[model samples]
Target chain A: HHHHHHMTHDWLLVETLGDEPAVVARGRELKKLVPITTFLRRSPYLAAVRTAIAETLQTGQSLTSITPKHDRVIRTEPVIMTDGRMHGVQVWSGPTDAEPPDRPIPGPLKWDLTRGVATDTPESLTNSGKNPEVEITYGRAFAEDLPARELNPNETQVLAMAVKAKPGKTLCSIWDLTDWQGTPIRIGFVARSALEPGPNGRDHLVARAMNWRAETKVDDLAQRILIGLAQAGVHRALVDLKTWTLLKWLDQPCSFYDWRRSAADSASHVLRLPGHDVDWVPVHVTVNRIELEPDTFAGLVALRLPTDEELADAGLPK
Target chain B: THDWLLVETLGDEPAVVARGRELKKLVPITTFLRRSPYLAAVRTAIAETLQTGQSLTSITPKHDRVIRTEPVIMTDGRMHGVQVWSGPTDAEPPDRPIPGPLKWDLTRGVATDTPESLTNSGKNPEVEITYGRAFAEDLPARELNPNETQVLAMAVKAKPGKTLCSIWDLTDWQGTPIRIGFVARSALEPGPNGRDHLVARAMNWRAETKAVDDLAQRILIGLAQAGVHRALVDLKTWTLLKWLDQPCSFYDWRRSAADGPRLHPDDQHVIGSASHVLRLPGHDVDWVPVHVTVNRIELEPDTFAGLVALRLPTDEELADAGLP
Candidate 1:
């Protein structure tokens, strides 16, 4: 079974700062990094990659084009920041024979933002194809403080870009719920501008929603980060602030929320563990806007673990 | 360091078939098997590899000693024997003062019964001699005293499935007082009516003993009190070296439930990385959370194993620690 090697498609993440792009990261399977000039000298298609990158940056759009021989395809996309600014371009050039067919969207919850409504597919969040009566608006979808009725800085920025109806301007968010039986349900939303406008002559927004919990595999980068924290003797959690729902937690023994309690009570309930008389101290909290996909943004709240001294001050044992 | 030996399983009795220069330098072929503490495991491993036509690897507890066996094929396209490799898991052996080397040349063909000739030889003088034809070419002929003959006869009488061992105070050919230890096993050849035979593969060595501090016991107690369980694991297979500690609430160590993976699928890369040491967050087979500290232990050069300390906290402890 021990043997020789075979040729396969390789990719590179290049930084376009200098006159010529330099390799920052390469495919994990590759043993060594080759000079970008070497590839450009060999393949005419790759030599023209700089042109595609220039066009992508100028138009703020992603482009996928093929070589004249159709043996290879090049995909160039501008890497955008959370503030809707372009940073660099990601180039993927590979053999066309190795290209995998596009995967179908599984149980997408289609939302018509202009109509202020959504139609959930069979396996979607609502588990029905009929249009649900749930209200769909910028505030209802992305705003955390519904009573104050305002979007945070990050949400406001993403909303501004989405409203522009720019091609490939995608944004994402996480929504969660505690069902009647108290089981946690997590759904992720990826939205972009639709091809056509609404009856009111405004840009129509389209989105696909899937169960985030089901999509999360055991070995994903996200799961590994959680594991790393646990090994460091830290407790952490990812919270969806808009829904005030706990998305995922690590090293936490018991469920923090009680279903019998009212929403307000559940949201502000004291963090307690069995056999402990005092409340656990919350050390640090940070709100972050993470990009879930290309040009897609989501608001995530991270809760850090308390230190040993903090635990002692709270009359708890480490 | 590693030593390799070829064992002939098709013979009337499983016998040391050949030994390399390094192996012979470690110990005479006639005595290597008898002096080894892992004789039983080695024999079983060899049998398993030959029977299954696959390689077999095993690790000893605490010391992390290693024994690997691979099947050897004959020129006639038939499985014949197995090649055994033994070594320490660590790159280097523990430091210890070297004893005076054995003068095998001076002791060759010496008569063990000549008490007067051995008078000033030394205290606790030891030597080895084989009586079977399998090792006749590799071993020098020697005259056995009555005591030596008795021990060899007893060892040769060991049952087919059993190994025989004995320790006795005797004198070498120079009449020097010495202690002798003997271990022997019997095997049958390949033919249907193959004759049973004994392979005299016992070695002799000077017995030097010492005493050490009890710090290991103290540290073990401290770890237990701290709720940390220490274990040795095979990095390649992720199998425990030996069962230790009481079963945790989440995972039962005694079960044979090997149906699926025992680690979180996503955390496998963290465990598989080339890093020499790692702290990984993972879940048990039952999906109960666990934190593991892995320290790479090299049994041989570049052959690594894991010395792991696992902590599985209770729900109350986790909550009290402000996890979530």
Candidate 2:
């Protein structure tokens, strides 16, 4: 009785490598991203990018003027519906405001960007980690992307977005477990800087985002955006309390004893709760990417100490 | 209005994947928590548990292995090709070479065996000794290295309870510190030798350590100051024994096959020592110690996805037979 279309929107975050042309190395394809975002919105704690959009709308900001600048490429964009003048507005791509301060802490405490500072110290981090208890294998994962300008309808006030990769559960490299659950919500903050053109003179980042969207609201656009990030290697993250979940645990694509299945009934499950109803203003989210200092791994990689012929097959021979 | 119990109203059916279509979405709810307020929490709690959301995927949980049932077996102070026991003997050093059969023979004892060399006496004897990563070289001299170290040392010193604490205090260290990222703690458990503590990796380290790279520079610098010294590299921990020495028996005492169960997907473990992200074979310690603490981090799907791949790949990696 139904013909499901394999429609999708792809988002790629490109970075320059030496002299190579910007490439779409990885991210979620259209199919996965959108579904994940929708699932996140369903999470009790995670609000809609629409929440920010809605709030910003009430503030009388022009959604159409929300442009982003980056050296990104757009493969293509198709019209979801043919509305030449009043029709195609690129409804969901634009600049987002940068609150400049709001590092989540012990209890989703807002920061005083004008005066306060965020800390990742043991005391500060004491507030970090999974929300109390529960497992988010992947993470209480949230995501976003440089505006898919190509897919934007005119005056859309959203640049970055929160997307769920798999529904319900998430995992990350921060720990040993996978599909870890916390307060499972994806919260992506759009830095005010991201809304600007790249250091390069190109200001078409916004347009590039739109063109990448084949159809307006590419089905699961968020998932595809995540795909690229995941492939590019961004996985572990702490969720902003104002985050959202993409799907129900039952809805995630999971493998049980190498058998096929679906989380058909997951959508009806109970939603997690948000601690506060206050729409906290964005101040800043402190992000940290840990690269090995080599010594942590250099020894593991370098096992040739003289008499320890024991680990020749382990890798290198020092 | 509330279908919270999870029982199906109509009872669902499975869809068989067809030829022309992409593979059917396989939604696995193995994530259903035993006592979660919700499932995502359970999923994360179990799947990526290094500490709180801990699971028993790779590491053998005490329950299955049953700590009472020894995880190792030794005939005469040596088993499978490694030394299992070596200690100070009252007797004078033996001039003659010792044989395998005489490992436990008190009569064939040597005078004194120091931490340096005690295992070479046996032939192909599986020696279970401490393993660790040792550093012996100079890193590219950077100016920030000095200030970073002082900042970290100061933070750790001031915290009294921790190795280090805050980054802003880094200004108190001497040189300018750059903010690299958000720092948070990953906790580890307690054992015979060490107390329960935290694993300050990237995020937490960033918050606490400062790095020149703009993100979570605080923790990075702190780690650089503390972990990396004249004997260490830029930002690394050298003395791994402090954490590894804590009682996590490797290949826990098992002489028989059936004594322990094979690792399964859903099996439970308090700590997974095989995790590439958290565990490494040839460090200054046998096990990487961690302390689980809740971290409410803003997920950078791309960055994390990359970290996951660099550290943890699916079992499919076991199939990459000939790749270098």
Candidate 3:
């Protein structure tokens, strides 16, 4: 006897807000498999789905689009009742080549650190659509202090240095924020100086943040030690060319601190970016500078860890 | 003095990737530890550490030697190999009873290790103090503790190719409470003695010593009460590292065949997608009617593990609630 089994695939219910596509609901099975809203937004099919949804909502019709490789198909239909009220759109997607779909490409959550504004906010960062209020700034949305808090002395210095740094150079740190209910949430933040100046003619910074605790699951002691090491690690600073007074300090938490902190503290650290093997030794703070750069001189502070030979030469622990 | 050895894990067998001068002198750096006198225990510890990404400290019964092994995770967030550290120490063993290694003869269904072989002193008159006695069939009838019986059964049933680890709380000879941790793996082939055996590396230490944060403890309790099973899973292999609570009953790790994939075929892509993005919503799979939530556990810049929560839904659950 032939058995009958239900043939099912993944589907999502989405709402259009201006040009952005927001997820409203998902099929029961799809919800279980792809739970995070941010993940759905990063899906390879998103670009096509966004296009289809825009056309469907405008023309009140259904549309289907196959991927360029012919490996997957996405279909969207605007939900319109007989009463002439359009609710939302239902999307269905599955593999056309009978193969499993590829994973969504990973990306960072973007923001404007200088102005404390979120450039791109994923629904998960908003507590899964629980808090829809977007008028609040980034600080007010997550900071522990209320009534428009000011950056601490350390934070101000870090921000100033970030603003003065050359474009494309990134500084990373770990910061503590709050959830909708004021529960503390730690996040890993990476700030990069924007290439173009802001409307005020001053350099601005763009940042990305990820949930630190969720990402690492490390203990409190390890986290505190990492933060302390990062604070003591290498930094870029702006110095007054004439007065020599510290104009700004670009200090952020370093992911390399765990492995490089000891070297840095012992003055044997070598600085290198991920995937690069070039060695850059730390120089004396005022020895190197970018003349008249951002109204001051740009300088490095303890930017590199020493080599093993150097450590041995100093009779220091490895 | 401490000796360090870096072993390469990317190959079929762990080889000496690099070594310090002290370690080089202690052992031939060219040869692998899998062929050493401490083969069984060392191999088991290294495999377990790589699988779980957790550090393991083991004490060899021969010289009462202790070695701490940690996974050498690279920037890409994958374990390239393990780092072994060993040195002399004045630290004394705990006052509680320690269950030394027991060699179980699979065909004969009995422990082959003599009592002397199970102790560092080579003269413990009390055979009961030895862990091999737990597998004795010729001895008089004695009440076997449930935990002891469970662990013994698990160790005996272990097949070649994978290591099994378990932690249990039991009372010692003096009836003092102690925690026993063990790693067991069956030999792929008969040893030089021409006997098929399984080596179970076990040790006893004090219990409930580490301090757990209050809020973390409360959250764990809440998750347990809510019928959610939280576990850490290797991102590369999808093998479970540890479960924060009792493991989910949908899959039995012990009976799972070595050649078969741990996850269902259709669910592999789901897990892959979730692993890449570091978060996923509740999703049901055909393997069992359980809903799983995967969150990324970032170990390093590129290294990650899944912090998964699995929940089994009841038949009547849908009628009460509308939708997620």
Candidate 4:
């Protein structure tokens, strides 16, 4: 529960699945920097190693060398149904429509969209089965920028931003679950479908894709950052209209929250804004969720602010 | 103009002969049936069963209930690999080099494969074929929207030329231009069908116009993508002719060294027999496997038919990456 304006933090980035020297070398570097210990109550052993077999591998082996448990924990399944849908929410762009952006990941979310999904058949001859196959890349994104940017009078930087963070995305964060790293190491799992539209603007459904994923660490630095800013994003996430008239970006069908306590202060960020006063960033977004999970995979952060005023600026509580 | 017939003179042959010409003109099959007693007997039985309370117990039903065949798994692996190209790299075809510039994907066709479409299924992914027809010119027919005609066509063509004969059409999923010839008392069948059809036909079946097509395409494409050739892709349901065939009879994943697990003796269908191994399904519709193929430099497999065979990565290749 520690973060604030200009949230910076120490993060341990991890490379993805492969035997590339860079990945292997990066992993070794991380392991040497932070010693991983077991969290078992009794046996203290890694749960168990998975069997090394065809299309499958064992788990819980040396971090230096994975057991290669052929199977991974998270799985993305693509289906082409009569009622198929492609990439659900038009994420980056503010919404024109609310319900999952008429397209789901991996296939044309709506079977009605002929060109949305890519297929093998020749378009001229295909009386049916038109449309490109669908691929979805969906996950979290981490950012150095926080909703709260200004500094305050009290002067205490809550955000912990790390240095030279060689960023990478992985299925599992490299954080040592056993030891305490100041705050509870909040971890998350993300599934994304990178939509690569193929020929005729049709998409080809596939496994493993490129993505945007970044995350912030949960620390004092996290709290000092914009608690109200993240809340606004959350409000935008939960509902569509009702307060559409008051939103900064009115055209987008999404609503964001300005997290406040039971009541907002008379002298608040919302009052400061041209449109409306909203000061509820903390109430909505946790320090862990700040970044898209893959971007700063380890969820480590060490925000170093020059002044303590940075904390007071986001308007952290007395 | 002549609405009424003369009601009085209904007795003699001459009178009958005079009206017989008109009667003969009115009905068509009378002359044909007049020659064979067997045919007459058959007709009499049909008439007797309908007109009287008698049953036609002696009649033999010509076409028995069609046997059920296994449904095909429609996947990219099957269509692109096995149906179109040469074969899967995991296991090469007998006496044949894997074809270069392979038309089909070879990743998903094999029983041993983990197709991305069905990779998550913990069960064994069995390999089975379906005999079906296409609605369109390619793999899928217009009428039957789910079938892939290209894979099916290739599969049918892959069969030996010396086998099979005939030119009759059957119901959907029941026949194709080539396999349809099977009904003509011919020989030779395609690989997957020849290997598994006896079991498929041993059971009862019904035609599935769309599902069969859908399943067949999935399997063929997955195979092709894996670099294997899918000769033909078809769809059909397996109906038990006599009894159910439990999948576990073939797949015994949990067998242990201490138990000495072994296959059951052939020619025995006894249930609950300790020796009766439970059958397990190889492929599941839930989580399909996706094959990630990359060129392997040091696998060192044999090259044949003017082609070089690629092998799975060896330790030597890993060394280049500074890997153990």
Give the TM-score ranking, best first.
1, 3, 2, 4
For candidate 4, report its TM-score. 0.14
Compose the digit string of candidate 1's lDDT tens values, residues B109-150. 111211111222233224432121111111112212223322
Q: Could you estimate the TM-score for every candidate? A: 0.26, 0.18, 0.24, 0.14
lDDT of 2 by residue, B228-312 (tens): 2211111112111111011222322111111222122122232101222223231243332221211111122211111011122
Q: Fraction of true contacts kept, per model?
A: 0.00, 0.00, 0.00, 0.00
lDDT of 2 by residue, A1-318 (tens): 222211111222121111211222122112222322343344332232334333332443323223235211112111121112110111122113221122121111111111111111221122222322332211121111111111222111221122111112211111111112332222211111112233456431111111121211122212222232221111122222222221111112222111111112101111212213332211111232222232211000000112234234333333
User: Model 4, B162-237: lDDT tens per residue?
Assistant: 1111111223323332111110011232345346211000000111122111211121121221232111111111
Estimate, for each residue in A8-42, the C-alpha lDDT of model 4 and write its tens digit: 01111111222210111121122211111111123
Cα DockQ of the candidate 1 complex: 0.01
User: Cα lDDT for residue A237, model 1?
Assistant: 38
DockQ of each: 0.01, 0.02, 0.01, 0.01
lDDT of 2: 0.20
lDDT of 3 by residue, A1-318 (tens): 222211213345454321345443343211212222364655665566667777887888988777758456667766553223343466766666442222211112434444443432343244211244643323321111111111121343343443344444444334344555656544433333444356687765653322112222222211211122232345433333342333333343223322121111212233333322323322222224432323533332333345677556655544
lDDT of 1 at A117: 34
